[PDB]
C-alpha cells in the first residue's frame, strides 16, 4: 500500500583494543610488576533477517554503522571488554554487493538465520603480556588490528513464489482482488498501480500460494506517466511466472500482435533470465461471448507461436479461477529444487 526504497549501507568493523603500558608499584616499593594485559576484540556486525519488515527506508537516514571499539587495557592487568555485536535487521529477500568485488555473497531466503558481514578486530597485548628480563624495562605495546572494512550494497526482492507481469491495468491488480486477502486499489481508470503488493490464497494447511503483483511498463524501457523501471527488480526471482494480455481494449493497443514486443521487453533486461518458462492466462472475458471466445483464444494463442496449454479465465467476476488454483500447485510441489 506504500512506497518502496532501496539503498546502500556503510558498515565498519570494530578494530581490536589497544595494549596498555603501566606498572604495579602501589605504596612502598617503587619497583614492582607491570600492569596492563589484553585489550578487547572489536565488535562483529551481523546480518539479522526479519519477516516483520519489508522495506529499507531506515538505511538512508542512518547510513554509517559504527561497531563499538574494543576496550583498551587498564592497570592491575584489567583486560578490556569485547566490543558488542551490533546487528542490522534486514527484510528477508536482500542481496549483498561489495564495492570492488561486486558480486553476490549471500541470498536472503530463509528467515531467522544470521550472516556475518564484518569480521571483528583482534585485541592488543600489554606490557604484562610482554614482560621480560632482556629489556629490564618492559614498556612496549602492540596496537589492535583494524577490522574488516566492507561496504554493502543492498538489493531487495520480496518473498513470493508466483509473479505478476503484464500490460498496464490489464487485470494484474484485479487478479489480486480474488480470494486473495490483499486488495490493492483496482479500477478501470489509468494504470492505478504505484505499489508492489503480494497476497496469499488459503486452500489447505501448510500450503502456500504467495503471489506478488508489480507495476508493468509499455514499449520496453519507456515510461508513460511517471512510473520508473525500478519496479522490475522485485521480479526475476519467483519460481513460477504467469502472463496475461488484455483482450479487446476500448482504447488500448491491438491484440497479442503487439505482445511480441513484450517478449523483447523481457529480453531487454539482460538476457530474459535464461528464457524462464512462461504461462499465459487471459482476463476480461465476461464482456464478450464465451462460446465465441473459445475460437478467439485458440486462434490468438497460435498466432504468436505459443503451442502450449493456455488458460482462459475471467477473473473480473471470479469465474473459472479454480482451474488455475490447483494446476499451479502440481507445478510447485512436484518440482522441487534439484
Amino acid at each position: 500500500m506504500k512506497f518502496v526504497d532501496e539503498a546502500s549501507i556503510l558498515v565498519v568493523a570494530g578494530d581490536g583494543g589497544n595494549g596498555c603500558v603501566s606498572f604495579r608499584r602501589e605504596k612502598y616499593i617503587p619497583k614492582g610488576g607491570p600492569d596492563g594485559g589484553d585489550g578487547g576484540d572489536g565488535g562483529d556486525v551481523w546480518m539479522e533477517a526479519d519477516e516483520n519488515l519489508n522495506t529499507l527506508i531506515d538505511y538512508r537516514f542512518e547510513k554509517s554503522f559504527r561497531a563499538e571499539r574494543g576496550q583498551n587495557g587498564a592497570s592491575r592487568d584489567c583486560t578490556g571488554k569485547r566490543g558488542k555485536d551490533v546487528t542490522i535487521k534486514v527484510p528477508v529477500g536482500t542481496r549483498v554487493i561489495d564495492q570492488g568485488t561486486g558480486e553476490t555473497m549471500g541470498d536472503m531466503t530463509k528467515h531467522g538465520q544470521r550472516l556475518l558481514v564484518a569480521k571483528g578486530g583482534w585485541h592488543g597485548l600489554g606490557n604484562t603480556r610482554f614482560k621480560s628480563s632482556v629489556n629490564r624495562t618492559p614498556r612496549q605495546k602492540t596496537n589492535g588490528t583494524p577490522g574488516d572494512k566492507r561496504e554493502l550494497l543492498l538489493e531487495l526482492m520480496l518473498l513470493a513464489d508466483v509473479g505478476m507481469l503484464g500490460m498496464p491495468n490489464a487485470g494484474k491488480s484485479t487478479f489480486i482482488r480474488a480470494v486473495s486477502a490483499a486488495k490493492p486499489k483496482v479500477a478501470d481508470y489509468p494504470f492505478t498501480t504505484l505499489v508492489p503488493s503480494l497476497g496469499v490464497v488459503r486452500m489447505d494447511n501448510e500450503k502456500s500460494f504467495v503471489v506478488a503483483d508489480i507495476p508493468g511498463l509499455i514499449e520496453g524501457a519507456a515510461e508513460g506517466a511517471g512510473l520508473g523501471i525500478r519496479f522490475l527488480k522485485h521480479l526475476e526471482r519467483c519460481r513460477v511466472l504467469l502472463h496475461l494480455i488484455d483482450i479487446d481494449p476500448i482504447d488500448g493497443t491491438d491484440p497479442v500482435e503487439n505482445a511480441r514486443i513484450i517478449i523483447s521487453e523481457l529480453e531487454k533486461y539482460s538476457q530474459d533470465l535464461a528464457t524462464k518458462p512462461r504461462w499465459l492466462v487471459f482476463n476480461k472475458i465476461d464482456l464478450l461471448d464465451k462460446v465465441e471466445a473459445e475460437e478467439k483464444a485458440k486462434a490468438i494463442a497460435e498466432a504468436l507461436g505459443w503451442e502450449d496449454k493456455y488458460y482462459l479465465i475471467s477473473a473480473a467476476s471470479g469465474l473459472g479461477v479454480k482451474d488455475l488454483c490447483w494446476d499451479v500447485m502440481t507445478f510447485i510441489i512436484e518440482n522441487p529444487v534439484v
Binding site: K2, F3, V4, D5, L53, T55, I57, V195
Partner: protein
C-alpha cells in the same frame, strides 16, 4: 490591554452583580459565578461593561484585557450557550448517553462511563456523534478534551474520537 478599552455589550434581561472582585452573570441558560484576580477594576456603566488596570501593579493592562475576554465568553453561554460536536469514527465504536452519563465502547475490555459536571449535557443525534452543550467555555472545553483523551486520534487512519473542526493528517510509516 487595549482589548479591555473596548467595552463588551451584554443583551437585555441579564443581570450583572458585583460584590467587589466577584461577578454574578445569572442568565437564561445557566447559573454560574466567577471571581476576578484582584488586579482589575470594573465599573457598572450603561448597557456595556468597561475594564481597567489597578495602580501599583506592574502587569496592569495585561490582566485587564483578560477580563473582557472571559466575560464576553460568559455572555453567549447565558443567552444561547456553547455547543461542541464529537464524532466517533471506526468499526465497533458505539456511543450513547444515559442520564448524565455517556457509555463508550471504544474497543476496550470494559465499557467507559464518564461523569459530566452539573451544567454540561450531551445528546446523541446518531450512534457516532456526541453533541456537547454548555454555558461555560472552560468546563465544556475540558470535558471534550477528557472525552478525547480516552481514544486520542491515531495519526495513520484517523481512527478515534475527534473534534468537528479538528482535522487529523494521515501519514505512512514503514512504507510497505
Amino acid at each position: 490591554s487595549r482589548v479591555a478599552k473596548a467595552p463588551v455589550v451584554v443583551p437585555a434581561g441579564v443581570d450583572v452583580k458585583i460584590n467587589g472582585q466577584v461577578i454574578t452573570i445569572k442568565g437564561k441558560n445557566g447559573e454560574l459565578t466567577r471571581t476576578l484576580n484582584d488586579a482589575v477594576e470594573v465599573k457598572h456603566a450603561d448597557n456595556t461593561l468597561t475594564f481597567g488596570p489597578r495602580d501599583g501593579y506592574a502587569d496592569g493592562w495585561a490582566q485587564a484585557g483578560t477580563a473582557r475576554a472571559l466575560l464576553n465568553s460568559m455572555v453567549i453561554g447565558v443567552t444561547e450557550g456553547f455547543t461542541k460536536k464529537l464524532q466517533l469514527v471506526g468499526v465497533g465504536y458505539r456511543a450513547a448517553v444515559k442520564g448524565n452519563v455517556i457509555n463508550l465502547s471504544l474497543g476496550f475490555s470494559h465499557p467507559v462511563d464518564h461523569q459530566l459536571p452539573a451544567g454540561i449535557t450531551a445528546e446523541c443525534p446518531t450512534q457516532t456523534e456526541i453533541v456537547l452543550k454548555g454555558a461555560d467555555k472552560q468546563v465544556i472545553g475540558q470535558v471534550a478534551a477528557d472525552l478525547r483523551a480516552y481514544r486520542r486520534p491515531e495519526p495513520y487512519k484517523g481512527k478515534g474520537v475527534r473534534y468537528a473542526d479538528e482535522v487529523v493528517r494521515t501519514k505512512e510509516a514503514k512504507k510497505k
